[PDB]
Amino acid sequence: IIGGTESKPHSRPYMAYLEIVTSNGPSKFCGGFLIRRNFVLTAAHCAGRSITVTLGAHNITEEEDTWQKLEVIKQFRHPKYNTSTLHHDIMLLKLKEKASLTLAVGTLPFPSQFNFVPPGRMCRVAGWGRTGVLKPGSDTLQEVKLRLMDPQACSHFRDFDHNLQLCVGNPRKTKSAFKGDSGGPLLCAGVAQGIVSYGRSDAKPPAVFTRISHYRPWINQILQAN
């Protein structure tokens, strides 16, 4: 997260930290959020060999009694997830066991098929990603307030689509989600409307987020099929 501040500890109990093992140059990490006791929502771009989720953390380098680390038993990537258009950058993760609902660890509701959040709104995003273009990731959870932009603010991104994605962050400011923040949710008025997906390598906002309302039925299909 670029140009933000450290979250108050445990003020965002749905924040999930994902450790991912790839079939190549070791682990990478991602943000994501708990939607139900054994299900986390993240980006499809955060798919890997094996994944572990740490729930209830603030500083991911020092464990606390709030910590709950669970194994991912299955990865439901979006099948239309395409590495070219980067469309459908959403994935559901099923946990081997159910997280215990505590004040430090909680669930977040995602929107309905008809909740279409428009340009102008200021939403918040949290994460443990890089704090600058070539800067290390953050040990502590950071968060930044960002403005939703009109579709045109993002047309520099090949294949940007209004119905499926969100254009996030004012072009005139530095604030933005960045590498490492992938998978974390965008909260608008207390509802998760997006998922950090991608942006420029130079970290200049806007960055593109997955628009979740649109995937509601699919999330639903898997959640009901378990």
Curated annotation (Swiss-Prot):
One of its GO terms (biological process) is cellular response to glucose stimulus. Disulfide bonds join 30-46, 123-188, 154-167. It catalyses: Preferential cleavage: Phe-|-Xaa > Tyr-|-Xaa > Trp-|-Xaa > Leu-|-Xaa. Its main location: secreted. SUPFAM superfamilies: Trypsin-like serine proteases. The gene is CMA1. This is Chymase. The keyword Ion transport does not apply. CDD domains: Tryp_SPc. Its EC number is 3.4.21.39. Pfam families: Trypsin. SMART domains: Tryp_SPc. GO terms for molecular function: endopeptidase activity; peptide binding; serine-type endopeptidase activity; serine-type peptidase activity. It comes from Homo sapiens. Keywords: Disulfide bond, Glycoprotein, Hydrolase, Protease, Secreted, Serine protease, Signal, Zymogen.
